Design a protein around this ligand. Structure first.
Ligand code: TGL
Ligand code: HEA
Ligand code: HEA
Ligand code: PEK
Ligand code: PEK
Ligand code: PSC
Ligand code: PGV
Ligand code: PGV
Ligand code: PGV
Ligand code: DMU
Ligand code: DMU
Ligand code: CHD
Ligand code: CHD
Ligand code: CUA
Ligand code: CU
Ligand code: MG
Ligand code: NA
Ligand code: ZN
Ligand code: ZN
Lengths: 79, 58, 259, 43, 46, 514, 98, 227, 84
């Protein structure tokens, strides 16, 4: 639905060689959206786009480390 | 306190051929020997430590 | 006989003892950091102190007692001190560069923000402001001391210089207490890293500056300084102002803007 | 530049000696270590 | 005061050209050999 | 008397002599290290069978050549010997502190040798980049001893810079303005200013690496919010000025040698030469990021650094053409020193030009960390620095010692060296263009020919070094004492005889203001 | 508000510093701190070069703003001329310290 | 890859590398002209008995040898920056692949749709199959679709490394905690080699990169079977 | 700026002493008042084992290798939390 995604497109907010923040941003967004939807009684499928983008750009060890930290309660980012 | 610089000027200008670091007297000698002994001994000791650390103790 | 105004120094053992003490201190830090022992470090620190004491003692003998500091020699020492202070400024610059690099682009590990998540900065309006008023005040008292010396007033020079030193000691004690009270440590990421290394090196410079001022205080008590010739005091005061300015930048950057 | 005649002239024989000794002081120690390289690698 | 003039403003002696050759040989030779022996040292540790 | 004179010295000539001695010895160590590098690359496969050792050799080679050979010789040796003499000063401003700048070097060198002796050495590259240089990838004392070596070398140079700038500013005859001092004196002062400003930043950076390794700081550790790239900036901010520091005193000596053997009383366009060196020094502080074109920098930042870097070619060109204009119309004396100077002009230009190729970030993407960079700096720095040092050494040896060298032997030495360095480094351009990485102990088979030829050329240069030692021995062995020196009216350092007395200019020169 | 107790240079300067100070007071320059002013430099009006010995190195800046200084030993006796501009210099030997 | 006795750059595989070759030809001619001119002038200054040793005026010729070099540098900078910005243009890739450097091998991740990832080690010399390249072959190659714009993201999980493929004009440092981006686009099918380009320790010389460029269709099948 | 005072006819020892006792020291007294007022120990925050804090890549060359140089038991938790 409005998808049919190949890869994360060019994001004018992160136009340079260092894409660390682009990955980070999309990871945060997906989890913030997933929280809001799971909370207020809604569907996580709206958070799809962010999941796809961060999946595409973020190294598996980063996502894995961040996931472990959110579970442990030590994720430094605001979700 | 009183100004005794003139006395010190006389002592340090006395023509005895002594280099400034020893011109104060016997104490300069002692302090110098202490300093130089610690420096040289400490350096030997550092070489020994290098020798010790150069080889593995598995 | 020479017919130029420059100083031909007697052959001296201090450059060698100084160089060796540098070897003992660096060797010593390595021994301490890796082979758990402080023996070398202790000897190094001791010979270093002995070298500095004897070397500067000799400079006082050469000038106050022997009269080797003609206007030309003094002018040279002025350039030397200015250049030394410049190199110190550049040293701190590297630390300020590290601070701004870290704080202006907070990485995801910090929570992507500054201060990092989990970091509760000191209130810049409490002891850090007190520290600022203390150093600024010592900058005023040292200027009073300088003018008293030039005006030939021994009592007031000693009075003003004493106040300056007391203030430096006060800053040091306050900073020591702040270090102990701080909820963050040097191991608390890049925040603790930049904070302690920058203010730590600054604190070291305050201790050095205070020591330099104490040396001047005692040389003053001994009447070494004339109302017109007192380079040791001038260098100590320039160095003191340098210490004062670095603090202002640390205060504005790390304590205030970085909070 | 002008100079006086050598005070202690070094004859061609003397130069051959100096040159040979000089070359040998560089070549022998290094050559020895390089020669025994395999004896060091696995021992 | 110190000795001045050719061969006197140096920390080594040039009184005898053969003793000098031996000095120079040890001096420059020791410097040149050092890396080879350090490499040997490192290979012989493991 | 021996200890008082050589251990407790307060004399600029004696201290310069110690520096020359120290530098010569260091050069032997550095050469040996370079030979081990080329031996490992001499044929496909492994020689040492231990790549960490190879990395340690490459690292030590650089440190020794830069900090213990070039700087001590140019600044400590020629600087101490010539600067006071060229301005008619009785000695340096701080004759006692000067002795400490020298004595800090042996301990500094000992720490470097200690780092290679303990553990598995520091196989980090002379850039010492973390995390490779950190406490996990390089656990143990090695990297810490290397950092300490650099601190001591740093203090020695910073104090030396303070001494040179003060001496040059404060101790000229009352009538002599800064625009009446020789170009070598100008070259030393500018070099000293670069040292004074750059070394403290290096010190800050390596101290942060030290704390990251031992005090749990995280300046360069991402886990604590640090950044390895920060280290690179701090390193290279000192690093680029450093390469200009290595060549500036060389530019100064080349100006004197070219003027002298062209039979000229002065260099062409004196003020343009002063301007050129100051511009180079200035620009040398705003181009450092050209050593980081592949770290992932913004395109605008890369365009700026490409542009700022190329501008340096303008002042440098003024110097090259001025040296040629100094030769113009001269009664050329084909002495060994002149040969070294002419080789310098050519080789330096070649290296400088490849530096201009590298300045273009687009091309640097492909050339970075390849042998093209190694070829570039071995021409500008290696040959440039070494040729200027050899030229100055043969030109002033009679002044320092009072003895003459055998000119024919000296020309033979130059010939061998010229062949050796070009055979060693020219083929490395090919290796780089075709993609061979730097810091490699072995290489894909296609690179075999050029690596073989390069390593052979490295042996020719070894033959030249051994010959040089012999040539110095022969001079001291024969004892041909100097009588007359031409052009003393425009070369003040020769005016007090060879060698000049312990104390010179006890009665200063007389110079009218008019 | 005010008082004394600090020595002056006149009361406490010693050694070479004191000598330079006293000489400066008399308008003399025994330690060569000042750049001497040139005469017309003719055969009849030569630049007088003080010396404590029988020869002294002279540096001649032939024309104002010249970057090249011409150096040469000036010997006791008949006036010598700068090898470059020909201006005359004559050595006037010793004394300084009474 | 490089072949025996190669003097210049490996043949261009991408349009950008082709662009660099022409730019390098342009720059190199200037380098040859200037260095030979300097060598020539040295020989010209040294081959005459005629002399002129009196003071020579400089404020005239210095204009020439200041303006000329300035012009030459602008003549180099123009095409250099055109290429620089050209490389930077927004391309919008059809695929994103990540590579992580390690001591001492590279790992790859194609996580656009499936979670595909694998390690890529150098084939030891002792295990090379006949006709294979020493120090350059790897067990698992980086299969990629030819004639497509691909976004490569580079990072590392330990020390610094650098991902390079000379034939494509690529070299991007692999820095831990950072995600560097570069774009890859091969004009032809084939095998393209590169080597770790940032000193990373003992085995810096032994962690190559091998790209396998095939048509999209083959790329897809490969993806599937690599699950 | 020009401050809000005046003098300048001649800056001497008297003037600088006036500034020391009339402006500088009083400023220090005020800040000392303000500081030894706003002090009072602030309630230490809950411990969270954040990975970017309490860094330990190599043990400290003192004590048990796990305590910072100016460790305060009251406010500095170890990597495993506050002390007993
Ligand atoms: C030592 C090994 C040599 C191997 C030679 C080539 C074999 C070719 C086979 C077969 C040849 C034909 C088939 C292959 C063509 C490939 C074209 C290519 O892809 O093209 C690019 C290639 C090849 O470029 C060439 O087209 C080769 C150019 C070679 C120039 C050599 C000058 C040599 C002078 C003396 C000998 C060398 C040592 C001293 C060098 C001294 C410094 C130059 O790569 C380069 O860019 C290399 C150079 C890098 C930059 C150096 C800049 C300054 C150089 C010289 C100034 C001298 C001026 C005075 C004139 C010279 C005065 C001395
Ligand atoms: C003596 C030391 C020295 C000097 C003087 C220079 C001078 C220059 N260097 Fe070099 N350089 C090094 C030592 C030196 N370098 C070292 C050690 C490294 C590598 C360090 C490492 O990684 O370990 C390096 C690395 C290096 C890089 C990084 C490459 C990489 O890692 O990918 C770059 C980038 O631009 C560069 C550029 C230049 C330039 C443009 C000059 C210019 O200053 C040159 C200017 C001179 C000329 C151009 C020739 C004379 C001019 C004329 C005849 C006029 C007419 C010319 C034109 C119109 C072009 N250098
Ligand atoms: C001044 C600097 C200098 C000098 C002179 C040299 C000289 C030489 N270097 Fe270089 N080298 C470096 C600085 C220098 N180098 C640096 C900075 C690096 C990079 C390290 C890194 O990657 O981290 C390097 C790297 C390096 C490499 C690349 C290593 C790799 O990537 O794996 C190679 C390979 O061939 C090499 C070879 C040589 C050779 C064969 C010589 C010489 O043998 C050439 C001939 C020159 C001489 C033999 C000098 C003789 C001088 C004297 C003996 C003094 C005499 C004294 C008096 C007269 C007073 N060097
Ligand atoms: C009171 C204010 C004045 C500060 C200095 C006073 C005492 C400390 C001893 C030496 C300090 C001198 C310079 C600074 C060097 C490192 C930073 C130290 C600043 C400091 O003192 O930071 C402390 C860390 O101590 C630590 O690790 C310190 C560990 C002590 C060992 C010192 C490490 C030696 C390394 C020195 C490097 C030398 C290189 C200098 C080169 C100069 C140029 C060539 C902070 O304490 P904490 O418990 O983490 O947090 C507080 C929580 N309650
Ligand atoms: C735990 C904290 C630690 C404390 C801080 C640490 C260090 C500080 C150290 C030392 C300084 C303190 C006192 C100095 C002691 C004696 C000075 C003796 C000379 C003297 O008495 O000087 C007098 C003035 O001093 C005087 O009031 C002395 C002046 C004291 C000034 C400060 C008092 C403030 C009072 C309240 C006013 C605040 C209002 C603010 C107004 C706005 C400001 C613009 C002037 O006299 P005279 O007749 O012209 O001189 C003849 C020769 N002596
Ligand atoms: C990117 C590469 C850049 C390429 C560089 C291009 C190089 C420039 C080429 C030519 C420059 C032309 C300058 C013209 C000056 C005339 C030369 C002359 O002849 O020199 C003097 C002029 O003084 C003077 O300019 C002083 C003497 C001459 C001044 C200029 C000489 C130096 C020229 C450069 C030397 C070669 C190095 C070139 C660098 C590449 C002669 O003086 P007069 O005749 O008055 O007195 C003699 C007495 N009469 C009157 C009886 C004859
Ligand atoms: C000085 C007068 C000349 C003026 C010319 C200007 C040059 C320098 C001053 C400018 C400094 C402020 C600029 C900051 C603005 C950008 C903020 C920023 O964010 O820059 C940051 C670093 O700046 C930083 O530390 C910057 C740290 C400072 C680096 C400059 C080095 C010079 C210092 C030495 C000079 C000695 C002076 C003596 C002092 C009295 C990080 O880098 P980014 O690439 O963004 O990374 C973010 C990515 O995730 C996306 O790509
Ligand atoms: C716990 C404490 C230990 C910590 C370590 C450091 C400790 C103390 C350092 C303090 C420095 C004390 C310096 C005392 C110098 C006394 C000699 C002096 O002051 O000498 C004067 C000359 O100045 C001169 O050399 C001026 C000399 C300049 C010296 C200043 C250098 C500062 C040293 C900093 C070192 C560390 C660097 C930072 C580390 C990262 C003598 O000339 P006048 O005064 O005109 O006298 C002549 C008249 O009497 C004639 O009438
Ligand atoms: C990891 C640990 C690293 C440790 C490295 C430590 C290195 C050495 C340690 C021992 C050094 C201390 C010994 C005392 C040195 C005093 C030098 C001094 O005071 O030198 C003076 C000159 O510099 C002047 O003035 C102005 C300059 C004053 C310089 C003071 C020396 C401080 C040394 C530290 C430098 C750090 C560099 C800072 C930048 C990061 C005096 O010159 P002299 O030639 O003596 O005399 C001339 C006579 O006419 C005097 O009558
Ligand atoms: C990069 C710098 C290196 C340059 C290359 C060196 C040039 C040649 C140096 C010659 O030195 C040697 O030659 C040997 C062989 O010719 C050795 O002898 C050895 O080999 C023998 C005979 O084969 C034996 O007689 C002895 O046991 C022996 O150790 C050897 O020790 C070594 O001194
Ligand atoms: C450029 C200028 C900078 C030069 C370098 C600065 C030198 C700093 C020296 C620090 O040395 C120390 O080290 C110790 C570690 O050995 C201490 O003892 C301690 O450490 C212990 C030993 O493990 C315990 O027994 C104790 O509780 C105690 O805290 C300690 O007090 C302190 O003096
Ligand atoms: C490289 C350095 C950042 C160092 C760091 O990351 O710590 C930064 C800080 C400020 C930057 C400069 C300033 O942003 C101003 C200029 C901006 C232009 O877009 C590029 C060049 C330009 C001159 C910059 C070059 C470079 O990116 C600088 C010098
Ligand atoms: C004005 C100054 C000193 C002149 C003097 O007092 O003798 C001279 C010295 C070097 C000259 C510079 C150099 O010759 C290089 C440049 C040459 C161009 O012809 C003009 C600008 C140019 C940048 C010059 C400007 C100016 O004439 C300078 C800066
Ligand atoms: Cu990985 Cu080099
Ligand atoms: Cu550079
Ligand atoms: Mg690199
Ligand atoms: Na090999
Ligand atoms: Zn004063
Ligand atoms: Zn004249």
């Amino acid at each position: 639905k409005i998808k049919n995604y190949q890869t994360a497109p060019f994001d004018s907010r992160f136009p340079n060689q260092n894409q660390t923040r682009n990955c980070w941003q999309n990871y945060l967004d997906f989890h913030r959206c997933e929280k809001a939807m799971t909370a207020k009684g809604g569907d996580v499928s709206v958070c799809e786009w962010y999941r796809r983008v961060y999946k595409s750009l973020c190294p598996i060890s980063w996502v894995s480390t961040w996931d472990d930290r959110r579970a442990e309660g030590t994720f430094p980012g605001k979700i | 306190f009183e100004n005794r610089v003139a006395e010190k000027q006389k002592l340090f200008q006395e023509d005895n051929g002594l280099p400034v670091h020893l011109k104060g007297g016997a104490t300069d000698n002692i302090l110098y020997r202490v300093t130089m002994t610690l420096c040289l001994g400490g350096t030997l000791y550092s070489l020994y430590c290098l020798g010790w650390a150069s080889f593995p103790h598995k | 006989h020479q017919t130029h105004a420059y100083h031909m120094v007697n052959p001296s053992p201090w450059p060698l003892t100084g160089a060796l003490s540098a070897l003992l201190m660096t060797s010593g830090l390595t021994m301490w950091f890796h082979f758990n022992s402080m023996t070398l470090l202790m000897i190094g620190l001791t010979t270093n102190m002995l070298t500095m004491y004897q070397w500067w003692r000799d400079v006082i003998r050469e000038s106050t007692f022997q009269g080797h500091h003609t206007p030309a020699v003094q002018k040279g020492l002025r350039y030397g001190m200015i250049l030394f202070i410049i190199s110190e400024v550049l040293f701190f610059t590297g630390f300020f560069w590290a601070f701004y690099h870290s704080s202006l682009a907070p990485t995801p590990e910090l929570g992507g923000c500054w201060p990092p998540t989990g970091i509760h900065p000191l209130n810049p309006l409490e002891v850090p402001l007190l520290n600022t008023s203390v150093l600024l005040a010592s900058g005023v008292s040292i200027t009073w001391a300088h003018h008293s010396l030039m005006e030939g007033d021994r009592k007031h020079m000693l009075q003003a210089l004493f106040i300056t030193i007391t203030l430096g000691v006060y800053f040091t004690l306050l900073q020591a207490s702040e270090y102990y009270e701080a909820p963050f440590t040097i191991s608390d990421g890049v925040y603790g890293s930049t904070f302690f290394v920058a203010t730590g090196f600054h604190g070291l410079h305050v201790i050095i500056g205070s020591t330099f001022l104490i040396v001047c205080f005692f040389r003053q008590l001994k009447f070494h300084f004339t109302s017109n010739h007192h380079f040791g005091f001038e260098a100590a005061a320039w160095y003191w102002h340098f210490v004062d300015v670095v603090w202002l930048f640390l205060y504005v950057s790390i304590y205030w803007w970085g909070s | 530049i002008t100079a006086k005649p050598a005070k202690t002239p070094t004859s061609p024989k003397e130069q051959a000696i100096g040159l040979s000794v000089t070359f040998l002081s560089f070549l022998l120690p290094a050559g020895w270590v390089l020669y025994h390289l395999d004896n060091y690698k696995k021992s | 005061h110190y000795e001045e003039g050719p061969g006197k403003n140096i920390p080594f002696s040039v009184e005898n050209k053969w003793r000098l050759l031996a000095m120079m040989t040890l001096f420059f030779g020791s410097g040149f050999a050092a890396p080879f022996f350090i490499v040997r040292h490192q290979l012989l540790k493991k | 008397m021996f200890i008082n004179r050589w251990l407790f010295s307060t004399n600029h000539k004696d201290i310069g002599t110690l520096y020359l001695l120290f530098g010569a010895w260091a050069g032997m160590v550095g050469t040996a290290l370079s030979l081990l590098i080329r031996a490992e690359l001499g044929q496909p496969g492994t020689l040492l069978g231990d790549d960490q050792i190879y990395n340690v050799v490459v690292t030590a080679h650089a440190f020794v050549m830069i900090f213990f050979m070039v700087m001590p010789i140019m600044i400590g040796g020629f600087g101490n010997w010539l600067v006071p003499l060229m301005i008619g000063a009785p000695d340096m401003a701080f004759p006692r502190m000067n002795n400490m700048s020298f004595w800090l070097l042996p301990p500094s060198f000992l720490l470097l040798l200690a780092s290679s002796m303990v553990e598995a050495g520091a196989g980090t590259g002379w850039t010492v980049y973390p995390p490779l240089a950190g406490n996990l990838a390089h656990a143990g004392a090695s990297v810490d001893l290397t950092i300490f070596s650099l601190h001591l070398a740093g203090v020695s140079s910073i104090l030396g810079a303070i001494n040179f700038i003060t001496t040059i500013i404060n101790m000229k005859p009352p009538a002599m303005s800064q625009y009446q001092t020789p170009l070598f004196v100008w070259s030393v002062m500018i070099t000293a200013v670069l040292l004074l400003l750059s070394l403290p930043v290096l010190a800050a950076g390596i101290t942060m690496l030290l704390t990251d390794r031992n005090l749990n700081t995280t300046f360069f550790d991402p886990a604590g919010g640090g950044d390895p790239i920060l280290y690179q900036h701090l390193f290279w901010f000192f690093g680029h000025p450093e390469v200009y520091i290595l060549i500036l005193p060389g530019f100064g000596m080349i100006s004197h040698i070219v003027t002298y053997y062209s039979g000229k009383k002065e260099p062409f366009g004196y003020m343009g030469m002063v301007w050129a060196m100051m511009s180079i020094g200035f620009l040398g502080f705003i181009v450092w990021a050209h050593h980081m074109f592949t770290v992932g920098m913004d395109v605008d930042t890369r365009a700026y650094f490409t542009s700022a870097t190329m501008i340096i070619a303008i002042p440098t060109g003024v110097k090259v053409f001025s040296w040629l204009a100094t030769l113009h119309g001269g009664n050329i004396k084909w002495s060994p020193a002149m040969m070294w100077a002419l080789g310098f002009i050519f080789l330096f230009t070649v290296g400088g030009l490849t530096g201009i190729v590298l300045a273009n970030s687009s091309l640097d993407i492909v050339l970075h960390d390849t042998y093209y960079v190694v070829a570039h700096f071995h021409y500008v720095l290696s040959m440039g620095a070494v040729f200027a040092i050899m030229g100055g050494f043969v030109h002033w040896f009679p002044l320092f010692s009072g003895y003459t060298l055998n000119d024919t032997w000296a020309k033979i030495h130059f010939a061998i060296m010229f062949v050796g360095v070009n055979m060693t480094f020219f083929p490395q351009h090919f290796l780089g263009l075709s993609g061979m990485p730097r810091r490699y102990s072995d290489y894909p088979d296609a690179y075999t020919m050029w690596n073989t030829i390069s390593s052979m050329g490295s042996f020719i240069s070894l033959t030249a070094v051994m010959l040089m030692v012999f040539i110095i021995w022969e001079a001291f062995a024969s004892k041909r004492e100097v009588l007359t020196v031409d052009l003393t009216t425009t070369n003040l350092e020769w005016l007090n005889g060879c060698p000049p007395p312990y104390h010179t200019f006890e009665e200063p020169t007389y110079v009218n203001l008019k | 508000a005010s008082g004394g107790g600090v020595p002056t240079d006149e009361e406490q300067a010693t050694g070479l510093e004191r000598e330079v100070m006293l000489a400066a007071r008399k308008g003399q320059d025994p330690y060569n701190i000042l750049a001497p002013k040139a005469t017309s430099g003719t055969k009849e009006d030569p630049n007088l070069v003080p010396s404590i010995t029988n020869k002294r190195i002279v540096g001649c800046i032939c024309e104002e703003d010249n970057s090249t200084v011409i150096w040469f030993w000036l010997h006791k006796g008949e006036a010598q001329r700068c090898p470059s501009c020909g201006t005359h210099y004559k050595l006037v030997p010793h004394q300084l310290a009474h | 890859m490089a072949y025996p006795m190669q003097l210049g750059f490996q043949d261009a595989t991408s349009p950008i590398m082709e662009e660099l070759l022409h730019f390098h030809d342009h720059t190199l001619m200037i380098v040859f002209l200037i260095s030979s001119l300097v060598l020539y002038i040295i020989s010209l200054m040294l081959t005459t008995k005629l002399t002129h040793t009196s003071t020579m005026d400089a404020q005239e010729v210095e204009t020439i040898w200041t303006i000329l070099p300035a012009i030459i540098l602008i003549l180099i900078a123009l095409p250099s920056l055109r290429i620089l910005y050209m490389m930077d243009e927004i391309n919008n890739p059809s695929l994103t692949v990540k590579t992580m450097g390690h001591q001492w091998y590279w790992s790859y991740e194609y996580t656009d749709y499936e979670d595909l990832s694998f390690d890529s080690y150098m084939i030891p010399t002792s295990e090379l199959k006949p006709g294979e390249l020493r120090l350059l072959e790897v067990d698992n190659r980086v299969v990629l679709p030819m004639e497509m714009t691909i976004r490569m993201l580079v990072s590392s999980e330990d020390v610094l490394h650098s991902w390079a493929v000379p034939s494509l004009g690529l070299k991007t440092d692999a820095i831990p905690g950072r995600l560097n981006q570069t774009t890859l686009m091969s004009s032809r099918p084939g095998l393209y080699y590169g080597q770790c380009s940032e000193i990373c320790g003992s085995n810096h010389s032994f962690m190559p990169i091998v790209l396998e460029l095939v048509p999209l269709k083959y790329f897809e099948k490969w993806s599937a079977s690599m699950l | 700026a020009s401050a809000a005072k005046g003098d300048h006819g001649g800056t001497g020892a008297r003037t600088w002493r006036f500034l020391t006792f009339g402006l500088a020291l009083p400023s220090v007294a005020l800040c000392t008042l303000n500081s030894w007022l706003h002090s009072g120990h602030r309630e230490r925050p809950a411990f969270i084992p954040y990975h970017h804090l309490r860094i330990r890549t190599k043990p400290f060359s003192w004590g048990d290798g796990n305590h910072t140089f100016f460790h305060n038991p009251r406010v500095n938790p170890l990597p495993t939390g506050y002390e007993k």
